[PDB]
Design a protein around this nucleic acid. Structure first.
Ligand code: MG
Ligand code: MG
Lengths: 277, 50, 251, 50, 1341
RNA sequence: GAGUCU
DNA sequence: TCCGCGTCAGACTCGTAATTATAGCATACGTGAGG
DNA sequence: TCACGTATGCTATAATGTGGTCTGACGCGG
């Protein structure tokens, strides 16, 4: 017995009939015509080819059994759209599918933030150019050296090379054995600390008292425009919907509320003190 | 022994916080045990008064 | 979350969840395709592997390594052992209103006292200063009080001095072998940046001045001020709990 | 060690006497780093039961 | 006798052992190892040459095409070290290698001459090593530590009583290759031999033997002897070797031709053995019952039928002996198997062995390593061949083969990397010999089994992985690719080789940050040996046996030098005179003793070779090139010391210092210090920050000058001569004709490295220590480093120390320092600090660097210039902006309250927010430099343009001075050559010099000299342009940065931190301490003379510590200053040059029998007064490690200064004025300011950032984090009862989100109220357990 | 990974 | 008796941030704006 | 109904079973 998933699947596909020339045509003839037995024993037989193609495309994106799975899906589409009428072989035709299905599925799953087909194939043109430039410019090629070789924008070469930058994992230690990782250092900036939390409570509870302080028509008109006491942040012209119904008198009364409040901030001890903030 | 008397306590939260975390939680899960937070470890965890 | 630079960073669970979803979605598609069982079996094996790796990575087989060559941290791992939630983030914690520094002697001090630096005590007792600054009528709001303290105004030193009188601070040394490894003292504000420790309690801490560092904690609540003063005060804790003999003994 | 050091620190140890002294120096300083973990683990086990 | 820089200040040496071998270069291992890795060796493959020869030529799977290595070359580095440290790039060289695609014809057998393509391909830039043994990676000097790993070869070992319960010592063997699978042989409780490869499952040991075609019959005829049993008529007979019946009981009546020798049940002693051997007894008659139990050796088939009567390896009996005799066999071979001597192991192993023949064994071996896979004859035979028997997958290497052969007591030293059949069997043989009795196991801790593996060899290893990674892509693209179109570079990839070597010079445990806060740290860190690393130990796998000190270390590795961390025996500094053996083991010099006379020929004995000979100790008195005086000499051999006769002495220790390291050599009076304290002292001496003023040590050893010079930090004279030009920035020296080369002008230039940052943010400055127009000898120190003084190492400062207690201000090693030490700014340290400002590219847009910043006072923009960068020289403090940076922000949702307040003032936040580089919180200094790196194409600031203007004009004047001094120096020689031939002195120097090169002489050897000087003048003239263009190009060149980054401004501050309470200080005997109080000068103790003490130490920090060297240092330091104060008094009095000559002469020749002998009659008057001028601060004294000054010599020196024998003076309290009750030990101890300074260590936090998942406070001052309250700290408050104190720290100070913000508000309201909740970390535990598939719920009240 | 207090 | 799994003191400081490789082009699929 | 990024699709010489670390210890089950 062997309890490894890989050497077990490899044992199963081993005891499978390696098809000859008109054996492929004989089964594929009834496969396109639609046969239970043909599709299985064509696919079952040609699993041995998938493994070899998947073996060469390794240490790149997925592990290995993952390349075989996506490789087997390409072999199934090779069988659905094979043409036995043509004198050409199946191993020729299916090699195009298994290299294709694996290339195309690696491009998607290999990265954490999902990178599309266009941006990746864009990138491969820049990468193969870089290797040709590197052998004659000894040092690695710059983004301008690559951009200037293809006569394409410097921002476009920079954009795509920036997406190539891989993601560092949080659980990875800087220390070594068991000191600290990146979660132990990186701050939650979305949750503000008690100092910043209580300042907006004190700023906004200070303002609730300064509303009751100014005149009755001035703190009504000023508050409901900014949406401080009211429900929606309206404009000078939209304060007319309430009771004001004015354009000029609203603008004079809004500014009159702010002018009396500017002197309330110069006396309490802010104005230029709270201008820096 | 100490290591065994610690794991024998009815409080599974005391037991899983000591050692054998993988084993304590599974044996408590299958027995459907309820820890009523008796000792100090339990209240230190939940952030209560000792 | 985004690292400062354009790089991002992710947990190892995201990488294990992605293996499980890929193999589950592919499995559904191969069942839709009515593929041979040989192919279906391989996919069911890989699903078991990815689920078992998500739950407990290093248990059934070889743990699934990511890019770094180390194995991907599983869910079980964040519960289990030392670096688990329990021992590191729950039976023990990082604490607000704490600092540390290099300790030095204070042979003028009384047994109930400890030298606490100016700038340490300023950062330690921030909310109590903003609270006195509103009561004395010096600052209108907290943002105003924040800048008064940041400028280190002359009035602020006087208020800092006012809060700290009769307000204890806890001092701790590693390793915390016995309860006397933490004792409470009344702070004395000093000139330099170094903690001054009472010589007689040096025995309890096992603290020699050849560059030891001691942690500071502020008991904020009134309960905590009374607990510091009644139980954990140095003058209250003279005999050893191990043996009925004084630990506070001249050397 | 079968050969003890006749000399003292005022008189000074010779080349070999020092080399013999180091055997015992390192082993002591070694227990200060390593064996403290066996002892400190006792502290932990005792606390969890009591 | 003594050179010019030595003439300035001679150290009085108390040595008495003439140094026959001078101290070697201390940085030898780093330079020599890497030198082998790069030096292109022609045949004797090493480093890169070996790498290519090993892997190439690589050939295709079709076998038609292949790639072949020709030759490689290193290109000059893109940026030199100077510019690498600045821009932040690796100092590396292009690797250009010639590779040829040779193609065979598939029709012809091997049609070799078909296509011979050729091109020189780039693959990677290998990092180059500096002159001081460093690699500059990303602008940081880094050192790769040499590894100490288990040597390859065979090594026999045994579990004593760890295997099994009985305590059967199971012996074992391991054949360890440099590459390839391991081969283990081991016993079992039941004494059966077994084999395991790569520690896989257990297989019978005879299974590998069958796999090597050994039949049952051959296997028994390798290990066992033969006993021939002759059947004559009826009586059975046996062939005797008398020696075999040895310590055995005679089972039957041993009787020969006519004599009964031994009776039944009687022990055969040595006499019975020689009785039979003297009588020459050959055949003995024996019973038939004696063979019952004997094992038959070979097969015996019936001649009559032709079938097996008995197979090989089967126990005979009376019925089988009857069948053998009658069949036609009256001569039986039999296995000789004693119970204690010649043991039956292979015999019982063969019965356990399930395999039958060769092919059955190969299957079984295949089935182990590749389980489940059905075997074939191709697969089984090919695997077993690819394990140990392939050129490719197996290599012991030269060291492996040499150690393998020398273990098996072989003749041959060098041989094959592949295991042969002989090798495997010989090893099984020796394993059985050890089980039997002759032979013992080797111990692993022996340095003869610990091989040293420096940088060059580990760089070669990783470079080989690079070529192996390319091997895949070569074999791949050779088969698929067309033969005609394909060039070799399309198949090679440069990124794998670059990446595998970059992994070593970056990710590797042994490549690390150079500890450069002190020349001693730099030089001892380069001399470091770590047993940790890839292919070595782990702390997990480290026992105590490897950690502790081993006999072999003596002279190779220092026993008093190692960290006191988890790495206590793993990391180790190299000894002084230690060296790497040709193979790799360590070795120590030894003076040979021929005819009892000690010869000055030195032999570097390896760990192995040392054990044979007896080595006398260095303590032994020679008759001054006669022989040992004393009849009995104290020596050591075979890992132990004892007394010996003189003719029996074989060797002797070369120096007194050889057992110790570089760190420990600098401890004075180490002989009187405990090993424990001496360790910490040598470790803290490395941490000593260099001070503002480099003060020499008064009480040194003499190794100071060796360390300072070899460290590389001091600018040294390449060639001697007169100094033409002196300056703070550079030194230009003209060379003497004899050493000066005839080609060039012969003027050396030393542009001294100026106030510059270190890796620990400390200072590095080179000050010129020679005056304007001074005659200098070759190899003298022209300029002093940061921690060096007139060539001697200066880690700290020496000062008047009084050992007495003081009001408990020196309680527990607490130190009381005078204000005068702080006032003199002598312990004040420079801290240059590097802070970078980066404009990146966010999603919304690129970041600007302008003085136009939203929300800023004029106080911040005041020190910035137009571009938004602080002026050079401008003092700055925490908060102040160094570089104005502004970042784009989306149109953020302003809260109505904010929108009001912005509409109240009018100043509304703009689209671009803010992220300016500002001085870190609390730190403060002066801006000494700003460096700007703009990307090629992005908008340049006007400040950047001023810096380009500054660098360019400075570069033009710098290379103008290069050609100017070189031109003047070159014609100076031409003028001297022109006089030798056509002398027209005054008249030729009147008109212009420009047309001097046209003038020649008649055709002599001196005319040929004029030709080289005129051609070289134009060579430098044309080189001046191409050089100036290179500088101009690099300055205009856009610096290519990381993705997203548009430009970076690097600001350099200079903090000048003085000593304060909290700062850590120490001496050199492990005597630590913390300043407690700076006592005013008025208060300090003072002697009757009136001179106040600098430091007051606690005397109770000495007896417990047992570090008495600090007290001998103090006494001698007092004596040293006593001489200085006498010479200072005589120079103030201005007595007489003959008087200074007499007093100094009596001082230098005061010791009982001193090694050095300074005759002052040789010194001229001018030379003496320069010397006296430096001795007046105090006569520097040298106390070698173990060959130091005695008490009598120190007390004798104290009398020369008219000071007490005691070294204790009556001091008087500064406060009161009255005397202390007794004399107090006072004197000068050289103390050191450690890097643990309190301004860095002090930290405090009330409220700050919180973590992402746990929602707890961050950790450390680097992140401004709160303190960890661990379970240890939790138990303390648990124990007291204070549950509120605890709950506070568990909830509102930690996770409780509503608790922490609410409590902050309670305390500001004044009300110290506990309003808690439940930690978010528990809420996380719940969701993490529920995601496991475990229902965990809060069943409530 | 190199340190500091035990 | 052998294989497997489980423990292995407490805080602190620093320091840095890497690599590979996936072809090329034509119709198909979804959403938003403009006539 | 195009514009634009994203996605799906197909290529017919034959090709058909995979290939990093190697040393802990002392206890306690199954
Ligand atoms: Mg002490
Ligand atoms: Mg200490």
């Amino acid at each position: 017995r062997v309890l490894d998933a890989t050497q077990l699947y490899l044992g199963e596909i081993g005891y499978s009939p390696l098809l000859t020339a008109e054996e492929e045509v004989y089964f594929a003839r009834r496969a396109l015509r639609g046969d239970v037995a043909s599709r299985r024993r064509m696919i079952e037989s040609n699993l041995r080819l998938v493994v070899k193609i998947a073996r060469r495309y390794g240490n790149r994106g997925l592990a290995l059994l993952d390349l075989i799975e996506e490789g087997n899906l390409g072999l199934i589409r090779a069988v659905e759209k094979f043409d036995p009428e043509r004198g050409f072989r199946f191993s020729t035709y299916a090699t195009w599918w298994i290299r294709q299905t694996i290339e195309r599925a690696i491009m998607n799953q290999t990265r954490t933030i999902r990178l599309p087909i266009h941006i990746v194939k864009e990138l491969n043109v820049y990468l193969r150019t870089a290797r040709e430039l590197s052998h004659k410019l000894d040092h690695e090629p710059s983004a301008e050296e690559i951009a200037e070789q293809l006569d394409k924008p410097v921002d476009d070469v920079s954009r795509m090379l920036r997406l190539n930058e891989r993601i560092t994992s949080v659980d990875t230690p800087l220390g070594g054995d068991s000191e600290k990782a990146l979660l132990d250092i990186l701050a939650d900036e979305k949750e503000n600390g008690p100092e910043d939390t209580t300042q907006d409570d004190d700023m906004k509870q200070s303002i609730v008292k300064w509303l009751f302080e100014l005149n009755a028509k001035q703190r009504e008109v000023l508050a409901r425009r900014f949406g401080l006491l009211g429900y929606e942040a309206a404009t000078l012209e939209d304060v007319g919907r309430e009771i004001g119904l004015t354009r000029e008198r609203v603008r004079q009364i809004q500014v009159e509320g702010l002018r009396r409040l500017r002197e309330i901030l110069q006396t309490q001890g802010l104005n230029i003190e709270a201008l820096f903030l | 022994g100490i290591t065994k008397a610690s794991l024998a306590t009815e409080s599974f939260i005391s037991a899983a916080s000591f050692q054998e975390t993988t084993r304590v939680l599974t044996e408590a899960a299958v027995a459907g045990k309820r820890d009523e937070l008796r000792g100090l470890k339990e209240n230190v965890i939940v952030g209560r008064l000792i | 979350v985004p690292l400062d630079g354009g790089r991002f960073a992710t947990s190892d669970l995201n990488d294990l969840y992605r293996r499980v979803i890929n193999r589950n979605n592919r499995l559904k598609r191969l069942l839709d395709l009515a593929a041979p069982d040989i192919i279906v079996r391989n996919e069911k094996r890989m699903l078991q592997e990815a689920v078992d790796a998500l739950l407990d990575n290093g248990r059934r087989g070889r743990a699934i390594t990511g890019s770094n060559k180390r194995p991907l941290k599983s869910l079980a791992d964040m519960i289990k052992g030392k670096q688990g939630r329990f021992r590191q983030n729950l039976l023990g914690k990082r604490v607000d209103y704490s600092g540390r520094s290099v300790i030095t002697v204070g042979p003028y001090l009384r047994l109930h006292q400890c030298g606490l630096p100016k700038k340490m005590a300023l950062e330690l007792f921030k909310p109590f200063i903003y609270g006195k600054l509103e009561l004395r009528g010096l600052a209108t709001t907290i943002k105003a009080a924040k800048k008064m303290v940041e400028r280190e105004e002359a009035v602020v030193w006087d208020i800092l001095d006012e809060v700290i009188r009769e307000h204890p601070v806890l001092l701790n040394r590693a390793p915390t072998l016995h309860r006397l490894g933490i004792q409470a003292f009344e702070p004395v504000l000093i000139e330099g940046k170094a903690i001054q420790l009472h010589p007689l309690v040096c025995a309890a801490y096992n603290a020699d001045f050849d560059g030891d560092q001691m942690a500071v904690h502020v008991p904020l609540t009134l309960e905590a001020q009374l607990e510091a003063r009644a139980l954990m005060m140095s003058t209250n804790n003279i005999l050893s709990p191990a043996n009925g003999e004084p630990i506070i003994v001249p050397s | 060690i079968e050969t003890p050091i006749t000399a003292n620190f005022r008189e000074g140890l010779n080349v070999l006497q020092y080399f013999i002294s180091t055997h015992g120096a390192r082993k002591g300083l070694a227990d200060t780093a390593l064996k403290t973990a066996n002892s400190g683990y006792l502290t932990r086990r005792l606390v969890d039961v009591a | 006798v003594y050179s010019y820089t030595e003439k300035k200040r001679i150290r009085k040496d108390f040595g008495k052992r003439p140094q026959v071998l001078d101290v070697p270069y201390l940085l030898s291992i780093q330079l020599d190892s890497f030198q082998k890795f790069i030096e292109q060796d022609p045949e004797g493959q090493y480093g890169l040459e070996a790498a290519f020869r090993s892997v190439f030529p690589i050939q295709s799977y079709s076998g038609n095409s292949e790639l072949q290595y020709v030759s490689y070359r290193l290109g000059e580095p893109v940026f030199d070290v100077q510019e690498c440290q600045i821009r932040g790039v690796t100092y590396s060289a292009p690797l250009r290698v010639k590779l040829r695609l040779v193609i065979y014809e598939r029709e012809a057998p091997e049609g070799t001459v078909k296509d011979i393509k050729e091109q020189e391909v780039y693959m990677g830039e290998i990092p180059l090593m500096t002159d001081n043994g460093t690699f500059v990676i990303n602008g940081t000097e880094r050192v790769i530590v040499s590894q100490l790993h288990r040597s390859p070869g065979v090594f026999f070992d045994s579990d004593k009583g760890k295997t099994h319960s009985s305590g059967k010592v199971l012996y074992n063997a391991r054949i360890i290759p440099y590459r390839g699978s391991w081969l283990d042989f081991e016993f079992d409780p039941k004494d059966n031999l077994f084999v395991r490869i790569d520690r896989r499952r257990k297989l019978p040991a005879t299974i590998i033997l069958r796999a090597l075609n050994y039949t049952t019959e051959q296997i028994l005829d390798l290990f066992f002897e033969k006993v021939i049993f002759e059947i004559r008529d009826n009586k059975l007979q046996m062939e005797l070797v008398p020696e075999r019946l040895r310590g055995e009981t005679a089972s039957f009546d041993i009787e020969a031709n006519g004599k009964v020798y031994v009776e039944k049940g009687r022990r055969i002693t040595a006499r019975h053995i020689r009785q039979l051997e003297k009588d020459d007894v050959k055949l003995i008659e024996v019973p038939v019952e004696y063979i019952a139990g004997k094992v038959v050796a070979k097969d015996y088939i019936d001649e009559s039928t032709g079938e097996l009567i008995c197979a090989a390896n089967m126990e005979l009996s009376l019925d089988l002996l009857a069948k053998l005799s009658q069949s036609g066999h009256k001569r039986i071979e039999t296995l000789f198997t004693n119970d204690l001597d010649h043991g039956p192991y292979i015999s019982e192993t063969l019965r356990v062995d399930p395999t039958n023949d060769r092919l059955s064994a190969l299957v079984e071996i295949y089935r182990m390593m590749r389980p489940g896979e059905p075997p074939t004859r191709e697969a089984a035979e090919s695997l077993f061949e690819n394990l140990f028997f392939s050129e490719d997958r197996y290599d012991l290497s030269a060291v492996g083969r040499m150690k393998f052969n020398r273990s098996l007591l072989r003749e041959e030293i060098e041989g094959s990397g592949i295991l042969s059949k002989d090798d495997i069997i010989d090893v099984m043989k020796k394993l059985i010999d050890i089980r039997n009795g002759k032979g013992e196991v080797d111990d692993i801790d022996h340095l003869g089994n610990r091989r040293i593996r420096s940088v060059g060899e580990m760089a070669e290893n990783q470079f080989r992985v690079g070529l192996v990674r390319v091997e895949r892509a070569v074999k791949e693209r050779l088969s698929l690719g067309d033969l005609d179109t394909l060039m070799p570079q399309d198949m090679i990839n440069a990124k794998p080789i670059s990446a595998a070597v970059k992994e070593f010079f970056g990710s590797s445990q042994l490549s690390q940050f150079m500890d450069q806060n002190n020349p001693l740290s730099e030089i001892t860190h380069k001399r470091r040996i770590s047993a940790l690393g890839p292919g070595g130990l782990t702390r997990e796998r480290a026992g105590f046996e490897v950690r502790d000190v081993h006999p072999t270390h003596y002279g190779r590795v220092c026993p008093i030098e190692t960290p006191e961390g988890p790495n206590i025996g793993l990391i180790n500094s190299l000894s002084v005179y230690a060296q790497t053996n040709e193979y790799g083991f360590l070795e120590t010099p030894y003076r040979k003793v021929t005819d009892g006379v000690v010869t000055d020929e030195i032999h570097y004995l390896s760990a192995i070779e040392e054990g044979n000979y007896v080595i006398a100790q260095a303590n032994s008195n020679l008759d001054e090139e006669g022989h040992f005086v004393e009849d009995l000499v104290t020596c050591r051999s075979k890992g132990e010391s004892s007394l010996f006769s003189r003719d029996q002495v074989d060797y002797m220790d070369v120096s007194t210092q050889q057992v110790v390291s570089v760190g420990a050599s600098l401890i004075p009076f180490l002989e009187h210090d405990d090993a424990n304290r001496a360790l910490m002292g040598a470790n803290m001496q490395r941490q000593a920050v260099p001070t503002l003023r480099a003060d020499k040590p008064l009480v040194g050893t003499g190794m100071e000058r060796a360390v300072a010079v070899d460290s590389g930090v001091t600018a040294v004279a390449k060639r001697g001569g007169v100094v033409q030009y002196v300056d703070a920035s550079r030194i230009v020296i003209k060379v003497n004709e004899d050493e000066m080369y005839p080609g060039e002008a012969g003027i050396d230039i030393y542009n001294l490295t100026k106030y510059t940052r270190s890796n620990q943010n400390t200072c590095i400055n080179q000050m010129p220590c020679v005056s304007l127009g001074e005659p200098v000898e070759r190899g003298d120190v022209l300029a002093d480093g940061p921690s060096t003084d007139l060539g001697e190492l200066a880690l700290g400062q020496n000062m008047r120390v009084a050992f007495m207690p003081w009001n408990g201000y020196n309680f527990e090693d607490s130190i009381l320092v005078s204000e005068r030490v702080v006032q003199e700014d002598r312990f004040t340290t420079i801290h240059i600090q590097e802070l970078a400002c980066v404009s990146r590219d966010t999603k919304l847009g690129p970041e600007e660097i302008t003085a136009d910043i939203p929300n800023v006072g004029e106080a911040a923009l005041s020190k910035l210039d137009e571009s938004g960068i602080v002026y050079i020289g401008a003092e700055v403090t925490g908060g102040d902006i160094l570089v104005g940076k502004v970042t784009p922000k989306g149109e953020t949702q302003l809260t109505p309250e904010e929108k009001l307040l912005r509409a109240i003032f009018g100043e509304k936040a703009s689209d671009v927010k803010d992220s300016s580089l500002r001085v870190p919180n609390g730190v403060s200094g002066t801006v000494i430099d700003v460096q700007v790196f703009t990307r090629d194409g992005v908008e340049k600031d006007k400040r950047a343009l001023e810096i380009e203007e500054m660098q360019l004009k400075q570069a033009k004047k710098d290379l103008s001075e290069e050609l100017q001094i070189l031109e003047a120096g070159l014609f100076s020689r031409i003028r001297a050559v022109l006089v030798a031939g056509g002398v027209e002195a005054e008249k030729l120097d009147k008109l212009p010099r420009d047309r001097w090169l046209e003038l020649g002489l008649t055709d002599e050897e001196k005319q040929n000299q004029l030709e080289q000087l005129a051609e070289q003048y134009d060579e430098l003239k044309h080189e001046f342009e191409k050089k100036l263009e290179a500088k101009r190009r690099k300055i205009t060149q856009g610096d290519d940065l990381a993705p997203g980054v548009l430009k970076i401004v690097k600001v350099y501050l200079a903090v000048k931190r003085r000593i304060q309470p909290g700062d850590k200080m120490a001496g050199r005997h492990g005597n630590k301490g913390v300043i407690s109080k700076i006592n005013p000068i008025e208060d300090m103790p003072y002697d009757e003379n009136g001179t106040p003490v600098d430091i007051v130490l606690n005397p109770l920090g000495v007896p417990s510590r047992m570090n008495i060297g600090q007290i001998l240092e103090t006494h001698l330091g007092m004596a040293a200053k006593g001489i200085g104060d006498k010479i200072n008094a005589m120079l103030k009095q201005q007595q007489e040059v003959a008087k200074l000559r007499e007093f100094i002469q009596r001082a230098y020749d005061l010791g009982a029998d001193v090694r050095q002998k300074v005759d002052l009659s040789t010194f001229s008057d001018e030379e003496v007064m320069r010397l006296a001028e430096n001795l007046r601060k105090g006569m520097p004294i040298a106390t070698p490690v173990f060959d130091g000054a005695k008490e009598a010599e120190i007390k004798e020196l104290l009398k020369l200064g008219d000071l007490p024998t005691s070294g204790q003076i009556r001091l008087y309290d500064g406060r009161t004025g009255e005397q202390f009750e007794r004399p107090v030990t006072v004197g000068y101890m050289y103390m050191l300011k450690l890097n643990h300074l309190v301004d860095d260590k002090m930290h405090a936090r009330s409220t700050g950032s919180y973590s992402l998942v746990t929602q707890q406070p961050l950790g450390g001052k680097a992140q401004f984090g709160g303190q960890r309250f661990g379970e240890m700290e939790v138990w303390a408050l648990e124990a007291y009862g204070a549950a509120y104190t605890l709950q506070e720290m568990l909830t509102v100070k930690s996770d409780d989100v509503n608790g922490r913000t609410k409590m902050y508000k309670n305390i500001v309201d004044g009300n110290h109220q506990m309003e808690p909740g439940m930690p978010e970390s528990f809420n996380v535990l719940l969701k993490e357990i529920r995601s496991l598939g475990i229902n965990i719920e809060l069943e409530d009240e």
